Design a protein around this nucleic acid. Structure first.
Ligand SMILES: NC(=O)OC[C@@H](O)C[C@H](NC(=O)[C@H]1NCCC[C@H]1O)C(=O)N[C@@H](Cc1c[nH]cn1)C(=O)N[C@H](C(=O)O)[C@H](O)c1c[nH]c(Cl)n1
Ligand SMILES: [K+]
Ligand SMILES: [Mg+2]
Ligand SMILES: [Mg+2]
Ligand SMILES: [Mg+2]
Ligand SMILES: [Mg+2]
Ligand SMILES: [Mg+2]
Ligand SMILES: [Mg+2]
Lengths: 70, 112
RNA sequence: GCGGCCCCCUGGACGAAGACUGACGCUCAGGUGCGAAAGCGUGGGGAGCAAACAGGAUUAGAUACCCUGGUAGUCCACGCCG
RNA sequence: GGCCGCAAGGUUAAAACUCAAAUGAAUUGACGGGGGC
């Protein structure tokens, strides 16, 4: 959390367990899982959207989605 | 009248049937979600229909925000196009969506 | 597991009263037999059925339920399976 | 692995690993292309 990393990306394909494959503005692909409120707000994500992706410096291969472009 | 009279009509009917065996209606449906080769399993059934002679109508469904997927959905229809390029003649292509469905129709190539 | 009728060979069970042997009993690891239907081997038989399979339908699809057929099997003799 | 079988297979019979359960009877409601008045 300290010194967080903030990026956008595009979701490419659906995975089981509501996890997702997202290409990143820098060319990298990451594995993403949903946050609580867009889970609590019943907001479902489809293929192809632009999404805001939080990253952590410990590992950049997997991130978390926090905001989807409708 | 005599019973024999029944056959000549039957022979004509089967001439109509072999004219109609193609006109039997078989429907195939797909979704943008379909993936992992389940598409190939359904193609296996399309093949068995064309060799018989029927036309096949390929339907594909978008629900609401799945419109973003029409850009990929038309390709799924195209993936049929390439697979049947030597099996089925292109007949009708859906230029527009109606009521959330794209409808495509193909008929088997009449091998010479 | 056993169902038409008759004959032949044969096991078991139960009741009455009396006589006889004199505990000769109960259970049982290993062991040995019997054991529906389906199935296997060799040779017969084959009406009715009926997996597989052919054809007609149904459905979005229907390798099914439904309709017309139909092979193994079902039957017999001797082995096997357990 | 052993034994049996012409073959299908039968019989004897484990562990790694994984979860905080699985289960039986009965109770009050909802539901049935279940009944009755
Ligand atoms: N996609 C797809 O598989 O088909 C759609 C499916 O819903 C058809 C449906 N079929 C059935 O119930 C089966 N029940 C068992 C016997 C055969 C069949 O009947 C059905 O609706 N039947 C109707 C008649 C019908 C119209 N189109 C096709 N079949 C029907 O009469 N059903 C009877 C009932 O409601 O009890 C019953 O099934 C029946 C009696 N006799 C016959 Cl034939 N069927
Ligand atoms: K005595
Ligand atoms: Mg006797
Ligand atoms: Mg004594
Ligand atoms: Mg014993
Ligand atoms: Mg038998
Ligand atoms: Mg039949
Ligand atoms: Mg109960």
């Amino acid at each position: 959390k300290e010194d967080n990393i903030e990026m956008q990306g595009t979701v490419l394909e659906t995975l089981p367990n509501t996890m997702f494959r997202v290409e990143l503005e820098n060319g990298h692909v990451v594995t993403a899982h949903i946050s609580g409120k867009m889970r609590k707000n019943y907001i479902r994500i489809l293929t192809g959207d632009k999404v805001t992706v939080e990253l952590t410096p410990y590992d950049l291969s997997k991130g978390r989605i926090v905001f989807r472009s409708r | 009248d005599y019973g024999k009279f029944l056959y000549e009509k039957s022979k004509s009917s089967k001439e109509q049937k072999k004219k109609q065996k193609v006109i039997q209606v078989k429907e195939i449906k797909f979704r943008p979600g379909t993936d992992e080769g389940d598409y190939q399993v359904k193609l296996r059934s399309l093949i068995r229909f064309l060799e018989e002679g029927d036309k096949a109508k390929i339907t594909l469904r978008f629900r609401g925000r799945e419109m973003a997927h029409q850009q990929i959905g038309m390709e799924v229809l195209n993936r049929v196009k390439d697979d049947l390029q030597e099996l089925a003649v292109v007949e009708s292509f859906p230029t527009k969506i109606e009521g959330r469905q794209m409808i495509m129709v193909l008929a088997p190539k009449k091998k010479q």
